[PDB]
Amino acid sequence: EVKDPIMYKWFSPDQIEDVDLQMGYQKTVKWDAFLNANPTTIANEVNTISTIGFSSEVVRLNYLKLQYKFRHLKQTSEKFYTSDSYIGDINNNLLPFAQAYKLASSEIIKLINHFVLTGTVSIQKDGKNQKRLLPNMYGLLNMPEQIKEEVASGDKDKMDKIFEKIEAGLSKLELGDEFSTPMMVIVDPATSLKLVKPYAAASSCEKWEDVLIQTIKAINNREDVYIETSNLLKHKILIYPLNSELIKFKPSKYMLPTPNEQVDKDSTDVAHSYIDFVLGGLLATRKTILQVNIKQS
């Protein structure tokens, strides 16, 4: 009776693979080559030749285990608090275990979705007082070594300027040999409202959404382009490929909320329960994510 996380719509089925771990790290190794100098012309006798160098890079993904505690009514004490149509103490905000666990799990899944989208953990509207996390723990928005474009405050309404920034970012993208892949765009409701205006005298049957889809298809080898609206974002536009070879999600198999075996019973009617969940596991290649920020200040 718990709704599926909304983060599933941001990934392809092949882009997600579970890992059996609660807290710790995983690591992978990649091998690269480079040219140290111009080639050597083979003429007459020569012993000193230009060299080709090699390199190894080890990428680590960290995982973190977190817990929450909630109060509820004791199973034996339920019958003294139920009623004809309302269950639980309305005055004291006490609920049965099932309802309390359902609501708490929903809240935790919302928190997990926010972390996966933005790479931060906070409960303030300002976004401050963030929980300090481990290195190598990033989301789709705070991933380093990506393409970042910023539209100025004065052009917060100019869709032409927004599209110019998006086009510059798309040009700076480096999909490379993995270009023949579907693409995913995530926008805020204000941007979605802006995208339906006619393209600019105004055109006929040509809208900014169609123009953006054509521009992205120009680089994705005319593959599918998907657009999603997320109220979690605000003045942000996110563009990235749905290719496992570039972006992958290896979450813990215990990432989603799970009840604990410990229950804090007492002489009274109030009991306490615990829920565990795991955070971390986003792997991304560099210069494959475009993030556009619309400033207001």
Binding site: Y8, K9, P13, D18, D224, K253, Y254, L256, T258, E261
Partner: peptide, 29 residues
């Protein structure tokens, strides 16, 4: 029927995985 709490947790994780697979099967963009 889960004999112990470890089996219960494994069943919960398998249920989450199956729900994810079913959601992707039923997804149509």
């Amino acid at each position: 029927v889960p004999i112990n709490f470890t089996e219960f947790v494994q069943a919960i994780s398998n249920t989450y995985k199956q729900r994810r697979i079913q959601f992707y099967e039923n997804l149509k963009r």
